[PDB]
Symmetry: D2
Subunit: 493 residues, 4 copies
């Protein structure tokens, strides 16, 4: 793992529309800060309805019949995606640093893990461009029918900071692969990662106006991209709240297609037969990976009575072993949160549990002064009524209940309004298959966790989301399906 000791510089801070770095009409530029240190990083600009509208207009152009981007052979879309990927891999070092300096994330995590993931989505999605096929339904009659999988149109993507670049990639890969044009709105907590990738797309040679990024504060662009009368798909990844907002506006605009992957409270279910060693390590990443800021974080470990206490032991034991240090520092297994917003919130949640008599086995507070560091916390004896068990503590905090039966645990996990993921640790074949099905989640993990690959479709059940991403199924959201039926004369089977 190379280290970019080079003081990371922010090369891009402006809006990218028509492959050109515009500015803000109001001339208003918001400020980005290093949450690991609280210092300011730079002054990216802030978009508004004008810029969204501006870019959306760019999109329709890119998407028009006989455009450069529509007549381009699909294989060539794939060829271009592969280049962005290859370009991102070349600049990996820096791009990895710009995520840490702005997302506050262990570098080993934003290099050995994140940027690699981003490249691999674009690589996968590239090889899926020329393989999205139609059908030739053997209809009845002397007619000949065939479905065509065709691009939707302009796609608006609202991303969340947690994974500044991975989700951008998870959304401009399936999109650009199927042939759609994207207006990307990156988050406020972190605008740098994307703006930079936009420059690499331009080097890749993507046509002018295919991928338009409109960095800028939420409320504003949101309603816009999500109510333009020219955008057809709004894909939002963020918290449930903003989500009902985006979907509402969707109806109240054009019935545009809406795929939203909100979050959830996911349950781990270690069982008497589990290899506690394994369950302990993986239950650990589950809650303390990226400082619990992954929508798939195990904010609810249920351990069977038999092995409740033991689990508790190592669980907290390893918890304290995390290091609230510098994401830009080696050996650091935990970084800042992200901002006073989540930061204060996290602490508040920690407090609530305390009030609720949570078994605060560790942490409970913050570490250090400048920046935003919370102390790897743990709450034993959590009950299904504790707030810590009813909400997304999106942050480092571990809650751990106790169950005595299989039916009870699967019921006590499915008693939520969420279903992004789950972990059943077991050493039994029958349990594995029953608890994997009885659980209501989009992705269940048996004896592992956080294992998400591009190939595998990912999304959420219930109010955890809408649609899927990655996979072969994530290219179903960005392609409409035109049936054409011709009147041939005699139709022979």
């Amino acid at each position: 793992l190379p280290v970019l000791l080079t003081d990371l510089k922010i090369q891009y801070t402006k809006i990218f529309i028509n492959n050109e770095w515009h500015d803000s009409v109001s001339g208003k530029k918001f400020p980005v800060f290093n949450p690991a240190t609280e210092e300011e990083l730079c002054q990216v600009e802030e978009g508004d309805k004008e810029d969204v509208d501006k870019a959306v207009k760019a999109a329709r152009q890119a998407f028009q019949i006989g455009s450069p981007w529509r007549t381009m052979d699909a294989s060539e879309r794939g060829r271009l995606l592969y280049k962005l990927a290859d370009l991102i891999e070349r600049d990996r070092l820096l791009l990895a640093t710009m995520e840490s300096m702005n997302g506050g994330k262990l570098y080993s995590n934003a290099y050995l893990s994140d940027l690699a993931g981003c490249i691999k989505t674009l690589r996968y999605c590239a090889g899926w461009a020329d393989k999205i096929q139609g059908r030739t339904i053997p209809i009845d009659g002397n007619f000949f029918t065939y479905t065509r999988h065709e691009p939707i149109g302009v796609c608006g993507q609202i991303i969340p900071w947690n994974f500044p670049l991975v989700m951008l990639i998870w959304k401009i890969g399936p999109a650009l692969s199927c042939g759609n044009t994207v207006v990307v709105k990156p988050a406020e907590q972190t605008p740098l990662t994307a703006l930079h990738v936009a420059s690499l797309i331009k080097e890749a040679g993507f046509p002018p106006g295919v991928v338009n990024i409109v960095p800028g504060y939420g409320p504003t662009a949101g309603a816009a991209i999500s109510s333009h009368m020219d955008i057809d798909k709004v894909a939002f990844t963020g918290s449930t709240e903003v989500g009902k907002l985006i979907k509402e506006a969707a109806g109240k605009s054009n019935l545009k297609r809406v795929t939203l992957e909100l979050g959830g409270k996911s349950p781990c279910i270690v069982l008497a037969d589990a290899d506690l060693d394994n369950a302990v390590e993986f239950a650990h990443h589950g809650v303390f990976y990226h400082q619990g800021q992954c929508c798939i974080a195990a904010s609810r470990i249920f351990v069977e009575e038999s092995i409740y206490d033991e689990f508790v032991r190592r669980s907290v034991e390893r918890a304290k072993k995390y290091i609230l240090g510098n994401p830009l520092t080696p050996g650091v297994t935990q970084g800042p949160q992200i901002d006073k917003e989540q930061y204060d919130k996290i602490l508040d949640l920690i407090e609530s549990g305390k009030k609720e008599g949570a078994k605060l086995e560790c942490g409970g507070g913050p570490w250090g002064n400048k920046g935003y560091f919370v102390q790897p916390t743990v709450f034993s004896n959590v009950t299904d009524e504790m707030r810590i068990a009813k909400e997304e503590i999106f942050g480092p905090v571990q809650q751990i209940m106790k169950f005595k039966s299989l039916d009870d645990v699967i019921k006590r996990a499915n008693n939520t309004f969420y279903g992004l993921s789950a972990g059943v640790f077991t050493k039994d074949i029958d349990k594995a298959i029953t608890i994997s099905s009885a659980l209501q989640a989009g992705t269940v993990w048996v004896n592992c966790y956080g294992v998400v690959s591009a190939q595998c479709p990912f999304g959420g059940f219930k109010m955890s989301g809408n649609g899927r991403e990655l996979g072969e199924y994530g290219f179903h959201e960005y392609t409409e399906v035109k049936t054409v039926t011709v009147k041939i004369s005699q139709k022979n089977s």
Copy 2:
């Protein structure tokens, strides 16, 4: 074609929940009327939040793990669907009559066409139950992944009267096939068709509480089924208005999955090389089939200059040849509309065009006294600014513009906020393929129209709809996709 001279009787007028004919809590029962005669047919009941909630509760029961309906082998779901189909075909005669007496529709159309269609969806969907398969993604790592296509849960279906039974079937086929449980809310203009089919499902042996129908006025159940905190999918087929309503509530409830197939203004594009004979006949069904009450009605025929007038001639010529008579009378090619609502509206639209200087080549008014009969109308010299060219005249009325180029016509059709369907009549290979793609519709028809088969996916682009129906793609809306990843030891390709 047999004729049910037998005075059609309304056997069912009450709510079907848990395979039992309940009543209305308020004891309020709405009245259904024969639009062909305006006489009342019977007194079906009217549901409310209580009954919706009642039935939704029935559903969750039906859908529970180890339920009778979930442990049932998929093949058996198919076996049961095939029986409903076979039962519907046995009772065809009557069931055909109950649609005419309540939908006001030519019997030849509700027998030789509609009921046949209804059976064939259920037959198709039945043979799709045991063939919805997952995958075994060759993921990276020594892990083994597989996607499972699993039932969503309780599905709420809001149907429109136009096709009282076909859409019920288009929605309880893909659903019941994939294993979901349905709470069906039929329309007010016509509750009889469905309630009856519900009885046939019970004879078919469908478990108790799988298919619950809650007949009842719109506003009420609507918000309910569409905001229950236990229904997961709301599929609505109706007008755009109610649609943004259902989707907005969706977000403002559970982010439940929402597939809505609203309507559209569809364009026919007869061209200089077309076989006017063919184009004339098919452009005729396009607008005057089921009294223009098909969301795919050609409310916009564009004829190239060369053959504008000629087309106009036969077009109107055949128009007058339609017969505003008795849907329950043989030889009648047109029946009542449906109710003063659409009836008055239709006439109003007719008037507006008159005010707009539409070339009222025929009709313009109503025919007969009792019931709701409009005179097959036609409006030549329509312009893209005439109201008749900007709205769904959902009723018998034909509008006919004139275009001089291919680019112009395809632009003047794609200049709408709709895209359910279209008809390009041509005798040229290149046109066919370009105009079929350049057009923005879910279903384009070349040299034919109204040709919709179950096998072929159907839905709408733009604000014409959301998702698809029928097809192999219509079983993509009712199945969620669970990825399970196991940690095997060594993984060999």
Copy 3:
């Protein structure tokens, strides 16, 4: 289970070509016998090159463009298949009896199991007729491509007696579904089952000359159907020997497509953690189901040392519990073999093991006088060098080795030239997935056996077979794939 005490009558004994019961040119009619009693059942006829050629000619007619069978909408092919299925289910009783009286098979097995299976293939395959679709490859260039899945042509099917009707159905379902025409050659040991089904197809209304059956001795028709210069696919299910014969002639005729599902020696691998109870019962059906005359019979159980002896105990224990009685007698769990051929052979194999020092724990000989009954036998301490462990003892005989490691057992099973199936009994998740993959078989069974459903593709690896059957993959053998590429003008994505 109803019982057809009615003295089963053989209604059909002649050749079915053009939906008509022809005879034999030579006038030669072979004799069929009841192996349960050795009495003769009737005198079916014997075909020859003339009759094969005769029927093949019928086929080409049925398959010609604009034929009745080619212009028939696929849905209608499915509709017709469903009727044969429904007809077979109506006559189930008798048809079940005609298999027992001729195959010598426990009635409970030829009713509660076999005929049910036959119906379910035809039901499945029926619902697969209208869903075999092409694609619309997004090729490069301004061209438009689409693959059409089209019928091969006349298909020749050589069946084996063991499952007289199930394999006929496994071959005239995928075929008739995809639209091909079949010339079926049934076995000598048992011609009745099929000839009868042919009559039911005719009642079903299948066109005249679609399904032509040419009953008749092997050698003769074989080379014919398999070297006609008008048949395109020869699907043979039988022993390896005849198979290399059919394939060699294939090349030496027309390179016709050849899918052959020969047999194999399949290995069960019970392990220390297995539920011996379960493993014992299922390992039992594995070898003594249908008198070991199933190509998937466990002629090789490997038990780990730990639980070797115990397994041996119950294994033989239950073995003796089988009853060499009357297949047409209730309570009989084992019937005759099939004919002196296999009968003598079986006994010979039994003897060879004895010579090899097999641990003859039970049986070893025949039971009763008339007919062909062998005594449920068992051979402990079998070694990988014993003939009983190198050949298909296609008959009741159980061999049981002992293994001490996982690697060793999976190696000692994969050391064959076969791979139809296998059974890994385990209670461990990791073993299950590794031994299921490490094993070289088309169908591996974990903790069960003989579980074969229509939906699941079935065939053999290595010299155990060629291609697959059932499944969605079994409609890949009977459909060729025509790519058509048109030169459209501008091609927009």
Copy 4:
């Protein structure tokens, strides 16, 4: 187009097994010659049963469980393929030259066309490695089934010279993608192209013993690779003769899977409405591309009476316009044939037609002295009885019949024992679809020809071939399908 004036050097002339350049056991090395000049190019070695057996042994090693090549994540197989592709593109210039110097082919054709094609297969096939998925059949019962698409094993590929590198790529792409190991036997007329690519695979980092090339004379290795008792798939691309040979040995060895794409006589069908301009140009490439040495060459143009003569005119007109010059010379549109073998044969065929009274409108003989150059020939007034119309004149020679009806022409084309391809030139929609279906070919071309892309499956009907290549369907030949069924407890839909 860069030109490798650099005297092309033959870097590789030896056998590649275990990523090492072995030699020949007999020490026998065959000689390769430049057919454009008849001079010798170098002295490649000649393999035998020993070397085949040698390499096959290497393969099994590469394919073993836990091998480096089997545990490799599929994505990584794709990553490696992409590198070979990228490496081939880097060396393009030379590799293009080594095909011309040895295949005798216009450089513009072996650069701007061939090497590009080779790279694009490997690029496509690479992106298909991680997307070959199984299924999760919703079987009946409380069982859980899933099909696994798994590598077959060692694959033996016999290539033909015509496209020395493209077919190597068409066979080591689908193979290496699905995970199989290949023993490639290149042709005698041309061994250089492949041996070189083998070096690039090694640079790509493909494991040691995955791709083993055994250059060497036909008869020898043939029977070997095709009868090794360790190779499972033999894919041969060549003439029909050798094909029945390879398939017969297949049965007479292991029933190994056999996909053979032999050749054919393909028919063009220009029609009265065709754009003769277009039909003329494309009918030209059809027969004179790569000197008629493409298995898809239009050795049978049928022109409707109306426009027979006209077609004849330009057809021959452009024919003479071809240039029998130097494939390594710019502006040369035709090169040598390949060797006295085809060369003498070609001339013989030309003579036969002369004897048959063919309307020798042009050519008829050879051009120049050294090398192997035939004069672009044409034969008008060909009849369906002329030898030139019953055999593959695999070489430059054009035959042109006359037809008066559609039915007649489609019958006169389908009256062959072949079906690789066809060209229907038309300007009518109905013809296009009927003649495209009525024709019996794997690939029909409407208004174009020779248009073959990787994405599109390609193979032959009838005795023109077996199986398909490219496409998503070409990864169905190299993957077997293991069904695993587990006994879960309760199975909920």
